[PDB]
Design a protein around this ligand. Sequence first.
Ligand SMILES: [Mg+2]
Length: 207
Amino acid sequence: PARLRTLHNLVIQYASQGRYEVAVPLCKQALEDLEKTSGHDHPDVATMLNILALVYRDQNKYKDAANLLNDALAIREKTLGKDHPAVAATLNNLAVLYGKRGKYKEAEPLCKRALEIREKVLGKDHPDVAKQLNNLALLCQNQGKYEEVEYYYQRALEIYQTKLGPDDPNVAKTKNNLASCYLKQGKFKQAETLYKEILTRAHEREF
Ligand SMILES: [Mg+2]
């Protein structure tokens, strides 16, 4: 009923205040009760599982967080669609968890799938598709895929520069990331050229 709607906002309120003492039981309650209502395979079951998984991730219960997210991802894929936005959202959460836990190789495919969903949903050129590319490029940097890192950061910059103005802060933030990647990979002459472009537009603005 609407009791599930109220119970949901209570789990958010206490988890946001870092009060998992209150948040976890209310979430496990909502979960137990949503199973009696419409079974395990329901969009809202995944919605609750997703919140509880984030609560576990923040509680450093990394192993358990992953099982709830893989559970939610499967429930979403079956009940919403393999290319549904909520499926991409769960995919991101998982890649974030794997990436934070140091498993970049295992995280990369989930992030690349989440990008494929965001492209279908928001269009091949979009400032969220360009946001997702900066995450994916960082993931490759932590592996040594310097060829992929340049390509992803560069495609994000192209989206950012055409969709948002060249003086947008994401243009400089992305250029700063590609610039720092080039330093890592010893491409010092190419990194300096990028730092000159970021500084010259900043100087241009004052005039
Ligand atoms: Mg390679």
